[PDB]
Ligand SMILES: Nc1ccn([C@@H]2O[C@H](COP(=O)(O)OP(=O)(O)OP(=O)(O)O)[C@@H](O)[C@H]2O)c(=O)n1
């Protein structure tokens with residue numbers, strides 16, 4: 001179809017002036033040193049979708065270093081010269097970095113063939129002669145305009161399997177869908193075991209992004225269809241009974257964040273993903289990605305403590321009984337428990353969660369009062385804890401609490417004196 | 418010669434990047450908004466001379482306003498349009514101004530129209546243009562050999578009637594000669610001398626002339642500019658009763674020699690007014706008004722001028738014999754800074770000296786600090802008497818050292834007597 005289009009009007013309309021002047025200027029610098037200058041990637045895409053974008057990715061046909069230095073004489077900022085990739089980055093002020101990379105000059109075609117998705121292909125030339133020129137050898141404009149995610153060629157995934165997760169994140173991100181031939185090509189690489197053949201850090205960064213994106217649940221369930229879950233983490237199985245927890249997790253994570261603070265979504269997920277894990281299955285998952293020595297312990301905790309919790313929620317036990325299972329736990333671990341709760345139990349587990357968060361306040365009485373009482377050692381802790389454990393269900397004068405509490409220890413023997 | 422040169426290399430090497438950027442931008446706007454864009458006039462001259470200029474003249478072929486609004490959309494400044502005789506002026510944060518104008522015929526004949534705009538100008542060195550539009554960024558456009566005239570240092574009008582069209586250029590040409598060390602060439606000198614001989618100065622308006630003179634006096638060597646003026650006879654043709662003779666010219670030298678000393682002691686000196694204090698001395702009431710209402714001069718000028726013009730000889734005798742300083746005060750009383758110059762205009766060496774000191778003594782020590790107009794409420798109420806008493810004790814104090822009060826009771830003998 002059409003390779004060229006005049007987004008020149010669209011540039012001045014959408015793009016902030018301070019930036020336009022940059023594209024304008026960068027283009028002129030191009031001419032001055034004889035290098036075609038293009039802005040590329042996610043900016044082209046975003047400008048087209050009316051979505052704001054500050055990233056200003058740039059390709060030249062010459063030498064990014066030579067160009068980047070020329071640019072600096074007239075642009076104000078820090079020049080970082082990533083030799084060995086012939087890349088560069090001019091750091092201006094206001095919070096702006098121009099990423100400058102290196103490549104019928106249309107060698108930019110070969111450069112745009114190397115990418116993931118037609119909508120992320122495409123380039124806009126910058127040299128004054130061709131200033132507003134949209135370049136689209138692969139009909140990104142078309143897919144962009146009918147919400148499509150096409151992987152430029154049949155080896156896109158083989159060449160880089162991380163695009164498997166990217167493809168998925170883009171769907172939720174822009175609301176687009178993956179056309180058939182990609183869909184087919186994805187599965188093939190997943191099943192070919194291709195993304196196992198890839199590094200931890202890489203698969204994980206991308207995994208994090210998916211979770212930080214618009215809709216997480218939907219993209220995990222999506223990830224499920226394609227059977228990538230099973231291929232990142234060798235033992236997990238996305239069943240109606242694993243999913244269901246996942247749903248629970250994401251429904252109240254907002255509550256967790258509201259009363260307890262940040263929730264590391266990645267981890268919150270691993271919890272449900274990583275359950276029922278033999279030691280040889282974890283020392284690696286943990287090892288391949290970088291999970292926390294021991295995280296395994298914490299998932300187990302909820303895993304094990306789990307059938308006891310709903311019972312404990314049924315039978316409306318006093319909070320005194322719940323504490324043991326949520327005592328210095330992470331927000332992720334709290335989330336994990338919540339993965340189990342539908343409806344009325346939820347309001348309760350939460351109802352105790354705020355009791356246990358609060359009223360932990362001993363007010364007067366601890367540490368001191370006890371040692372003046374003349375007690376020492378690890379005991380102090382247990383007596384303190386067992387006072388508070390009852391202050392969460394009904395309060396006296398917080399002294400009389402001990403004078404009743406130490407007694408309970410006496411005539412069962414507790415220290416001496 | 419070469420009508421077209423590529424000075425792109427100079428632009429980047431010799432031009433401050435913030436400006437050299439604004440050029441690139443102004444030229445890109447041009448292409449966007451479809452209009453050739455040039456910088457012209459003074460800047461191009463100065464650039465090629467390696468001189469700094471922050472008054473950038475841009476000429477566009479198209480609407481000037483249109484282009485200016487379109488520029489601001491993308492620039493950080495204040496925009497004043499000037500609607501009739503379309504031209505715009507863009508004030509930028511950097512402390513500089515873009516002056517934007519429509520070329521005005523009202524590849525395709527782009528050069529014709531700009532050449533029309535250039536031919537319209539005063540001198541070759543100022544009739545140059547540099548194209549900003551990206552396609553031709555470096556482009557120096559020089560039809561009239563203004564480039565070669567820079568290197569040769571030559572000043573040259575563009576065509577035979579350059580002076581007939583704007584006789585005010587008679588003065589500009591002398592200015593640029595003293596400003597850069599250039600010499601007005603033969604032909605334009607021939608031409609310059611007619612315009613003045615025939616009377617194109619009297620034919621040009623007063624106010625334009627005065628400004629152009631003020632400019633000549635603010636520039637680098639005014640004495641030279643005035644002498645060059647006198648060599649072309651242009652002085653008689655500005656002021657009909659002033660004859661620039663060895664005497665007047667000695668006065669002028671002494672004047673300009675002293676202005677500086679006078680500035681760093683009495684402050685701003687209007688040099689156009691000082692120079693008039695010489696040009697007009699011994700003017701008659703009639704020829705004075707004539708010239709006053711012609712250059713919108715101050716009305717009590719003539720009195721001050723007559724004041725020196727009448728006492729100069731007295732001042733000369735006083736500074737002779739070294740007459741003590743009580744007697745010269747009344748000559749310098751409450752007079753202009755220029756009036757102070759005008760005197761100095763008559764002086765050189767040793768007299769200039771002793772006269773310098775006097776004026777110090779006079780502004781320097783006129784304290785009367787101890788008394789006031791209280792000491793005078795101690796016995797006297799007359800509106801003129803209070804005022805004379807005071808100016809009386811002053812002069813006593815002007816070259817005499819004594820307490821204060823006790824000289825009042827003392828010189829009040831010369832007063833209570835008679
Ligand atoms: N594994 C990858 C990563 C990136 N790209 C290409 O590089 C461009 C820029 O990478 P990135 O900045 O991550 O693109 P976006 O997804 O739009 O940016 P973000 O990840 O922040 O959303 C993409 O548009 C894509 O063309 C690719 O082909 N293969």
Ligand SMILES: Nc1ccn([C@@H]2O[C@H](COP(=O)(O)OP(=O)(O)OP(=O)(O)O)[C@@H](O)[C@H]2O)c(=O)n1
Pocket residue numbers: 457458459460537538539540543544583585586589
């Ligand atoms: N009588 C005049 C006055 C000006 N010009 C043109 O208009 C330009 C701008 O006028 P001006 O600002 O006075 O130029 P400069 O002499 O450089 O500025 P200045 O007088 O302050 O030195 C000049 O370069 C010249 O091309 C002209 O041709 N005829």
